[PDB]
């Protein structure tokens with residue numbers, strides 16, 4: 001956990017954008033690119049809601065989200081039902097991040113109540129899986145991620161950066177919230193977390209009309225990659241405005257490829 | 264409920280690497296413990312002739328111990344930390360198997376062999392070049408772990424493996440991440456999510472006085488315990504098991520043994536002892552005067568380790584009661600003990616004949 005450049009995250013799970021888009025083609029016969037992105041946001045929101053119900057800290061939710069994104073970056077939406085995968089990712093992340101093993105009753109109650117209370121526009125029927133399904137999906141999730149469990153996030157480097165600036169109280173809460181928002185995109189699959197952090201800090205400086213051009217100039221980082229991430233962030237807030245998940249998600253879910261049954 | 268695509272499922276099952284197809288290990292068990300079982304195994308294809316270790320993890324599914332061992336060993340890479348080669352997941356029984364290079368030896372068996380000699384009026388102490396080389400490589404491995412934010416938390420002779428004849432002859436491998444944590448791992452208000460522990464010989468005094476933090480200094484104490492046991496063949500803080508197990512941190516008899524060896528710390532030796540959660544229990548149960556003639560000097564002197572030796576002076580810095588006054592791994596590696604003749608060697612057996620018996624196979628019903 002101390003060295004990103006030697007990590008499985010860096011060496012296996014920083015993916016090329018073109019390969020990522022190439023893999024997704026299998027699912028895009030059913031969904032537009034736009035609808036695929038919406039579905040990814042939706043499931044990010046589902047995982048955030050599951051984590052909130054279980055009272056898990058943000059790092060656990062973030063790790064779960066990365067497992068979900070990694071899984072469907074390699075495999076089809078129809079390979080394993082994402083409705084099972086989302087709580088399975090939370091279950092595994094809780095172990096990895098040292099919260100512990102969520103009890104049978106708490107996990108199923110969380111999935112049931114969350115979909116019922118907060119996502120009933122997309123889920124007319126109750127959560128249909130039991131704990132045995134979670135456990136079975138957990139084994140599959142573990143092997144299919146090649147046993148890569150330690151995930152680096154932008155929160156730690158963000159904190160170090162704001163502290164280096166001497167602007168913790170001023171910039172942190174906005175920058176942190178922007179980091180949360182980046183989980184609505186593919187950025188965690190595409191860029192080192194410190195670069196995501198810098199981009200988020202930058203957007204927060206823009207929003208708060210804080211000039212910090214000097215401090216950013218004194219960093220030895222690929223500014224062109226940072227600018228790429230900044231453009232993704234600005235773009236996610238335009239998509240946010242235009243997306244109504246409550247009005248749109250039922251139709252998008254019905255277009256999602258479903259697992260072929262056994263013959 | 265069919266959550267998985269049929270075509271995906273059949274393809275996965277077709278191509279899945281299965282431990283029992285790839286390795287021969289039946290009747291080849293060589294260890295058992297709270298961790299599970301270890302087998303000495305051979306490849307079922309003829310493609311290589313190496314010995315492998317297969318660790319069958321205790322219990323069903325992904326326990327907390329299974330999870331942290333897989334998570335951490337997946338990331339780590341250093342000549343003194345056991346390297347995880349493969350993880351096999353057996354879906355039918357939900358059993359987890361870990362694959363490693365086979366280590367013929369470990370410190371538990373090495374120390375046992377010497378202790379048995381002394382007890383046989385046919386005495387052999389551990390050679391002093393070997394002792395030093397082992398310590399150096401232990402320190403090297405833990406320094407790498409610490410640098411990468413990993414605390415081991417269960418250092419003890421059985422967890423210090425040594426490679427036998429082959430390309431890594433005499434190399435130390437630190438094993439068993441079942442108790443490990445990151446510096447920043449959350450503190451769980453109730454029990455530590457670890458396997459059950461019944462003996463506490465390697466456990467730093469601050470833990471026995473109820474300190475809740477994960478620290479590098481805790482591993483350093485345990486390594487001090489190991490160094491002493493290598494110098495004398497005896498576990499320095501050996502103590503009987505308690506009749507009545509409880510999960511609380513305070514263990515009276517273990518502390519008593521420690522004070523019998525080290526003496527009872529004076530106020531100036533460990534100022535923050537008064538801040539330990541169990542400090543008033545300590546004041547209730549103990550009187551410092553009981554230990555007035557006890558010290559590490561007197562203990563080690565009885566076991567033929569000279570107190571003016573560089574080895575003794577290093578040992579004393581590792582076995583310092585106050586964790587903040589305990590030497591770090593990197594400073595220990597810089598100690599002049601390691602510059603004194605003989606230098607530590609990368610093969611701890613220094614090219615000489617290995618007298619240690621190979622592990623025997625465990626054939627009992629469990």
Ligand SMILES: NC(=O)c1[nH]cc(-c2ccncc2)c1Cl
Nearest residue numbers: 298316318363364365366438439
């Ligand atoms: N408790 C453990 O994890 C453990 N203990 C001993 C081994 C082993 C490894 C490799 N060769 C022989 C034995 C392992 Cl793995």
